Design a protein around this nucleic acid. Structure first.
Lengths: 282, 279, 314, 136, 136
RNA sequence: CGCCACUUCAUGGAAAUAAAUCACUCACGAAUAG
């Protein structure tokens, strides 16, 4: 076959700079180069150069001397256009009362950019306001234009399509073999290393994909570390609450890693600090 | 009944390639008139294109255009085709998408050609074009000018910041002259028009050749912009009235489009030919 | 001037993008190194880019209606969101900040964004087996190229027309007749004027509720992952935009392995020796269907491997 | 358009003067592409954008890309040196100052067609003169 | 421009000398177009640009297009020989050195009227003599 | 929980390549001489 029409699932919201289009989805400008690098790395059994020689012998390269690019066509299109749009900040703020259904807030997140849009500024998406009954407990208001003019939005869509076209059948077979591992290993977006890129592939060519996440992670990464987070009941309600817990936990742990936590009242030292002051204590 | 003026309205870009090796930027340039250096269609190319359109009617082609190159007998052509000189060229603006650009020297050449060749409806056109020319010269008083005939198109940038349009509210543009020369008409000084119509300002199109998705060649093509107007003279010889009437009716129908020039397969040079309407 | 690009009140998009783009204002500098990076130049180019991407096109636009009248009925397709990019290699950059660093293809007279017919012809032919010339630097790629393209075009032909069997020689003749209007071995065929495949310029036909042009970023992160990436700004055709594809296609007659014109095929049919197993036909409707399927498969424009310029049915 | 042998001589001298042609009569391969790109930019974008692009020296390019603008100025200076008194009344025969920015010189002198014709002449001369040499 | 038999023999010898005709009397087919196009390039572009274009060895041509310039130089040199040397003769019977490229020689020696005539006649002889061989 | 930003803004490649380079017809016809 010359076409690969895969249906993939979104696990965590994607931060997208070109969100003003209703057709905003995964950008193949990130997928295709990273997928080429991953595919050539797998071809050489861990080495990029050996995989490049492999693709050179099989004529899968656009150019045999300059670049890493493989010859195929990547297309990512939305099936259903409904999007769940998220606001991503670094601090926690009172939620608005008047609020569109698409709008949800992941307030305590690793993504700390655009922190000023939850300020008192007139350019802030959610304008904070003093409360009248209590001279504390800030009030929240929503500005439609400000939410429309935001640089980056966190987006979640339903199942959509990634289409891979090539006239070289063997490349398509190897792409079918390695695509679940690629998506299980790589994240796409802004601050994607912190988790705003998580995707999994469900149907490859109208066939379910039984790909174990643990085994692929074990294969393609030096260390893989699982954490079982206490899913307090729910699990059928408030995916927004699930996202809040997940990203607050990520912020917790990663702030613990390379820094401390001088927050409320509990102190735990930076493990990045504690590593160097212990090993060769200089 | 002998000499007729036809206006060529090009529905797409036109490339009548000259036989020229330019070692600068533009590999393929278009034919320019041997005297005024303005873009033109050589009479041979125009005759070939029109003959190609009528090739199905063997009798009409044989009687009007002559015999085929490969024929035991050769028949002289009866209808005379004159070269298509440029009349109006679209120029990009800021107030309007494009205006129809004519020059005072182009108008002078048109008046001279109409006087010399005695077109069918030449008298009133000559009179009004002349009057317009003296009015323009009286207003300009030697300086360079860009005269529009709509008060809304005042201060329009005619493809260059230096060329700004002004409306002289003493020169009337008759409706038939508007039909002949174009809807949004600007009349420029010869300096301005030659600047706008030279090899550094004509539209250029970039083309490349790919081999398995990788570029092998790269060249630039000069084209005459879309909706440009060129005029050519047709002389009826001793041709038969029936074939001549069929030829004129087919040529001047709204559903007739003729391909002139190169790059036919990619849409270059599709034209509509219109006879000179009575004034 | 604002939305609704019309022949009456609108600036030429190509003129704005190429000529008026780098205009010198009293207090704008982009000659010195300080000027190019200053926020005054960024604001100037932001205003220019807003003016570029502040234009709409109505469905009943007189320009598109004239195009439909001139070029026959259009093949209308829609734009996916990478966007659509054409004429990307044109030189348009000064080294400034906030400016469009990539070229764009604008029709000179109308200013409407368009895809030249040469691009459509090349894209359509690229998936036909004989789109690669032997040369001698191609020799190694040529055998595999023709094989895969033959299989793809064979399945497409069996899909679109009521022919149950085609051959490699028939595919060669069909491709050469469609694109070169000749035979694979040089010499021409006495074709009628109508019997000629013309690929007109695809045009933007309808920006339904939004503008037709957008601004997009490609950020090539360098081969050194520890150095700063380069944000590159360019101009794209917005998603969900109706692009009209105009063609002038005919019916192709294939008797035995050779392409026949209508005049020849009439006499061939009237001959006392004939074989329906040897006479194949591809209607202009089926030719348009084939071209539409090719366009849906591969798309049009630049950065198509990245996805730019892919279509669905309207 | 026909490039004179005098223009080619000026181009050769300018290419040697702004250290483009080495003492072995060889040049870096990227300068041919530089000159072709400059011609394309001049015809497509305009004189000001192309000259501003190729006058830059903070460009991280593989070679000294401002050298073609220097050669352009040298060729134009040599052209203006041989202007006649009949030409000097119509054309600007002044020698372009060496330290003076070429883009600034064009901008302060308007956008006259004379400068555009001179730039196009000198660009084609640079193209041909580079073609005369070997590319190591 | 009548057929000059002596120039035809010069062209034959120069075509064999600059490795165009193979031992079997055949030549690369593209050289026909090279010879045919050189005259038009000289007429409508100028002698120096045409020579520079055909002398270039960094070309994306299907064969060695620069061989025709060497054949041209050989024919011209053969014509410089057998020149009636006298005080009144305009023609310069000085042979073109092999180390000098043809473009340099016309650049350094600025009497193009003789060179233009010789190059035109040599190109005509080239085109007429190429027809004796098979066009493989 | 409170506060808050700085970064980066085009490089490399292709710059024309092949086909046709004139073809066919007329190359003197009559008259005056014998």
């Amino acid at each position: 076959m010359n076409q690969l029409t895969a249906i993939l699932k979104q696990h965590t919201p994607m931060i997208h700079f070109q969100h003003n289009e209703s057709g905003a989805t995964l950008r193949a400008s990130e997928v295709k180069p990273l997928l080429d690098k991953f595919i050539l790395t797998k071809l050489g059994n861990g080495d990029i150069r050996e995989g490049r020689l492999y693709a050179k012998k099989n004529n899968w390269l656009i150019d045999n001397e300059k670049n890493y690019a493989l010859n195929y066509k990547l297309s990512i299109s939305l099936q259903k256009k409904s999007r769940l749009e998220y606001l991503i900040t670094s601090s926690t703020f009172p939620l608005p009362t008047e609020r569109p259904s698409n709008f949800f807030t992941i307030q305590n997140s690793p993504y700390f950019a655009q922190e000023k849009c939850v300020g008192i500024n007139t350019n802030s998406t959610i304008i904070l306001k003093k409360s009248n009954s209590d001279p504390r407990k800030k009030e929240a208001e929503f500005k439609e234009k400000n939410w429309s003019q935001i640089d980056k939005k966190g987006l979640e869509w339903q199942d959509f399509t990634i289409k891979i076209f090539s006239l070289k059948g063997d490349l398509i077979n190897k792409i079918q073999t390695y695509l679940p591992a690629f998506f299980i290993c790589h994240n796409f977006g802004t601050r994607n290393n912190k988790g705003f890129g998580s995707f999994t592939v469900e149907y490859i060519n109208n066939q379910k994909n039984i790909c174990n996440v643990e085994d692929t992670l074990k294969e393609n990464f030096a260390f893989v570390y699982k954490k079982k987070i206490a899913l307090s009941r729910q699990s059928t309600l408030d995916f927004i609450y699930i996202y809040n817990q997940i990203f607050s936990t990520i912020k917790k742990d990663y702030q613990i890693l390379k820094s401390g936590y001088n927050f409320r009242n509990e102190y735990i030292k930076s493990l990045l600090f504690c590593y160097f002051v212990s090993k060769y204590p200089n | 009944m002998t000499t007729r003026m036809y206006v060529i309205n090009t529905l797409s870009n036109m490339h009548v390639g000259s036989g020229e090796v330019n070692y600068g930027v533009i590999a393929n340039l278009i034919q320019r008139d041997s005297v005024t250096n303005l873009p033109n269609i050589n009479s041979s190319g125009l005759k070939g294109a029109i003959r190609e359109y009528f090739k199905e009617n063997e009798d009409l082609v044989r009687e009007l255009f002559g015999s085929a190159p490969r024929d035991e007998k050769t028949l002289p052509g009866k209808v005379r085709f004159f070269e298509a000189n440029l009349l109006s060229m679209p120029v990009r603006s800021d107030k309007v998408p494009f205006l129809m650009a004519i020059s005072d020297e182009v108008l002078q050449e048109l008046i001279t050609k109409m006087k010399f060749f005695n077109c069918e409806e030449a008298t009133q056109y000559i009179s009004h074009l002349s009057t317009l020319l003296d009015n323009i010269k009286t207003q300009a008083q030697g300086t360079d000018f860009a005269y529009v005939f709509d008060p809304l198109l005042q201060g329009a940038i005619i493809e260059e910041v230096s060329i700004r349009a002004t409306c002289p509210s003493h020169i009337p543009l008759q409706p038939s002259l508007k039909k002949l020369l174009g809807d949004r008409l600007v009349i420029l000084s010869h300096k301005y028009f030659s600047i706008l119509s030279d090899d550094n300002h004509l539209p250029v199109l970039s083309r490349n050749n790919l081999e398995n998705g990788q570029s092998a060649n790269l060249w630039y093509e000069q084209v005459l912009p879309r909706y440009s107007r060129l005029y050519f003279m047709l002389m009826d010889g001793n041709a038969q009235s029936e074939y001549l009437k069929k030829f004129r009716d087919t040529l001047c129908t709204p559903s007739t489009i003729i391909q002139i020039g190169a790059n036919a397969s990619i849409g270059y040079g599709y034209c509509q030919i219109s006879e000179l309407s009575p004034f | 001037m604002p939305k609704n690009y019309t022949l009456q009140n609108a600036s030429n998009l190509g003129w704005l993008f190429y000529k008026d783009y780098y205009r010198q204002e009293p207090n704008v500098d982009f000659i010195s190194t300080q000027g190019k990076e200053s926020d005054t130049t960024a604001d100037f180019f932001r205003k220019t880019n807003q003016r570029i991407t502040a234009y709409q096109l109505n469905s009943e636009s007189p320009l598109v209606a004239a195009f439909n009248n001139h070029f026959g009925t259009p093949l209308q397709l829609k734009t996916i969101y990478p966007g659509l990019i054409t004429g990307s290699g044109l030189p348009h950059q000064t080294g400034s900040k906030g400016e469009f660093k990539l070229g764009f293809q604008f029709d000179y007279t109308t200013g409407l964004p368009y895809i030249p017919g040469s691009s459509i012809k090349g894209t359509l032919r690229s998936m036909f087996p004989f789109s690669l010339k032997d040369k001698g630097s191609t020799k190694r790629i040529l055998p595999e190229y023709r094989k895969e393209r033959m299989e793809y075009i064979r399945d497409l032909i069996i899909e679109v027309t009521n022919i149950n069997e085609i051959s490699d020689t028939e595919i060669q003749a069909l491709e050469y007749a469609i694109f070169t209007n000749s035979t694979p071995s040089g010499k021409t065929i006495e074709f009628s004027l109508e019997e000629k495949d013309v690929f007109y310029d695809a045009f933007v036909a309808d920006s339904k509720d939004g503008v037709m042009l957008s601004d997009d970023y490609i950020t090539p992160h360098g081969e050194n992952p520890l150095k700063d990436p380069k944000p590159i700004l360019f101009l794209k055709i917005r998603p969900d935009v109706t692009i009209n594809f105009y063609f002038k296609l005919c019916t192709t007659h294939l008797y035995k392995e050779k392409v026949c014109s209508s005049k020849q095929i009439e006499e061939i049919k009237k001959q006392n020796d004939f074989s329906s197993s040897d006479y194949k036909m591809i209607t202009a409707h089926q030719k348009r269907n084939l071209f539409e399927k090719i366009l849906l498969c591969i798309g049009i424009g630049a950065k198509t491997n990245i996805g730019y310029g892919q279509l669905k049915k309207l | 358009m026909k490039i004179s042998k005098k223009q080619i001589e000026y181009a050769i001298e300018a290419l040697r003067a702004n250290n483009i042609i080495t003492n072995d009569n060889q040049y870096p391969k990227v300068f041919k592409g530089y000159i072709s790109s400059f011609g394309a930019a001049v015809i497509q974008s305009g004189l000001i954008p192309a000259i501003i692009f190729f006058e830059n020296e903070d460009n991280d390019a593989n070679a000294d890309r401002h050298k073609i603008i220097g050669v352009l100025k040298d060729i134009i200076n040599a052209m203006r040196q041989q202007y006649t008194v009949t030409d000097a009344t119509i054309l600007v025969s002044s020698q372009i100052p060496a330290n003076y920015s070429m883009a600034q010189y064009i901008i302060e002198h308007g956008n006259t067609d004379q400068l555009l014709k001179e730039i196009t002449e000198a660009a084609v001369a640079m193209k041909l003169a580079l073609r005369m040499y070997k590319s190591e």
